[PDB]
């Protein structure tokens, strides 16, 4: 976990690039967490954001403006849960983390399109969300197209016609997103983006996500077709709607939108997304690995397959991962891509 | 249901009182439904609001501005459900043409940044106390409501405890709202009220909570399963104001202008498809009580112990079904406020 202290730095830097209102009485400040969820991660970065902005204001001898935080995700996000975590609003002029000193709002809808009125947001934040395709590309779901991913469940495996269908899908999504964002930022505002990426030149090698969805996860899918309970043209009809861009893929769309300035762009290693308390323990490797896959896209498996038929798959992965626990602690690395954008 | 067409009129009128931005490119418009729920009622009035404002803009030959709708309620509200109902956003009835956001927190205090809201709407929510008054939950106070479950029955020290609690809540609410409306903005309020001068006679809410509902509470203590000091510790946190009670707090806050104030009869809150049917009168009656405060009963009593109470009311209501179709009337109070 000693890389979050390093990542909070990149965020600090983008936060510096934001044009603060000079006036003695600056108008309310708006911050948005895009692709929030229902966890505490969302509330903590919002906390961090308004905290730093306030500290800037104090550095110029100004009272911090009023703050609104928007928590944006798909209508299927568990806002109910999110809303119960939100700390209560500060009282009168016994005070002193813990409490909240900003207004809140949860925003339902896809961020691959407009979510807010024009020019009303100061700071957009997004983390580990932009790698989720708006949909499976139509062409890979068409049995007669060359992009139809027969026998893989994901694009790590192979198929140029399949891999380039995903990338196009990514770049359209991210284009729509950027256009939406540009219309919504204030003149002097900025954007912090972090999604997972890859270093591979070829979309067929999906780095981290490749080893997360393309090893034990499709092998379990292959063990439920080497059984009964699941058909062959069934696993072929299931496609994880996820693409991990390279710098090139990301950067292209940016200077093509041309609304945002690139203040900073970085690909690095923030590998190993498994909380493992006993490293040498072969079985903990299993359930950890499995538990990621579940939280990521377990809802999709059950919308395409049985709910108990999924518990046998997610039961085979966590059997696979322990078997091959050696090649996992060593080979499961995630590459990150961060973008620090400013408008104008 | 042929009184909603008449009530949509009062809303239309308030909507006319709002100062629309003159400019060719007016900034975003903000509308808030306070005390929204998860049903369709919320999404239709929002729809109505933005539809009227747009039509006004067109009447002056202006493109309507962008719209945001805020749906406010307590963090216990089923926002998940509410957000599934929301219609998708317009592409390049049915359809939606405004941005949405759901807002968790009590409206008896601040919910938004100063001067950012054009129109506040609230319907059938202001009559819910922010809490049972501390004094009526104190065994040693004279306001302790011994043997009633509600204030309809009796008790001046009990009834005046509620009223104070109402006025304090409504005060705090108004203060919050005043700091959040735009200079040229307006507020539409409707909750239930009474005509009675004496807080002891809670009109509609009196007959909803103070007849069969506490009688069933009296049949679960004339049994076992529930103690006597147990029904005395349970108190429906609801107050129906009179025009006095309401209007007082308004001109005491002094931020809003009263363009209109009305008490009227929008009685009978029971969907009954066979009127002469004695049993339909029961379950209708009972189902109201349930949707209203059934969560409170189970937080104070057993979940199956509540299904036997809400099972006695619906047995009581059918019994005197005659005195219910005729005596179950709700008085409403509406307030059309503008700022300045
Ligand atoms: N099109 C879209 N619009 C809004 N949210 C989306 C989205 N596509 C994916 N997401 C959301 O992005 C999230 C990815 S998981 C990210 C969790 C959080 N940002 C964190 O850093 O811990 C999910 O909650 C998912 O619902
Ligand atoms: N202090 C408070 N803050 C926010 N919402 C409140 C509240 N007290 C009560 N409410 C909400 O007000 C609602 C009363 S029922 C109102 C239904 C809706 N307004 C309609 O017209 O049909 C409930 O959903 C309740 O959660
Ligand atoms: Mg497939
Ligand atoms: Mg009592």
Question: Can you walk me through this structure?
Answer:
The structure is a homodimer. Chain A is of the alpha/beta class and 344 residues long. The first copy, chain A, is built from eleven helices and seven strands. A seven-stranded mixed sheet of chain A has the order 3-2-1-4-5-7-6, with helices on both faces. In chain A, helix 3 links the parallel strand 2 and strand 3. In chain A, helix 1 (4-16) packs across helix 2 (40-59). The longest helix of chain A is centred in the middle third of the chain and has 25 residues, at 160-184. In chain A, 41% of the residues are buried. Bound molecules: S-adenosyl-L-homocysteine (2 copies) and magnesium ion (2 copies). One magnesium ion binds at residues 149, 152-153, 235-236, 238-239 of chain A.
Brief digest:
By secondary structure, chain A is of the alpha/beta class. The first copy, chain A, has helices spanning 4-16, 40-59, 79-85, 160-184, 207-213, 216-223, 232-235, 247-257, 282-302, 307-323, 326-329; strands spanning 29-34, 67-73, 103-108, 121-127, 185-197, 260-269, 335-343. The first copy, chain A, folds into two domains: 1-204 and 238-271 and 334-344, Rossmann fold, CATH 3.40.50.150; 205-237 and 272-333, Non-ribosomal Peptide Synthetase Peptidyl Carrier Protein, Chain A (Orthogonal Bundle).
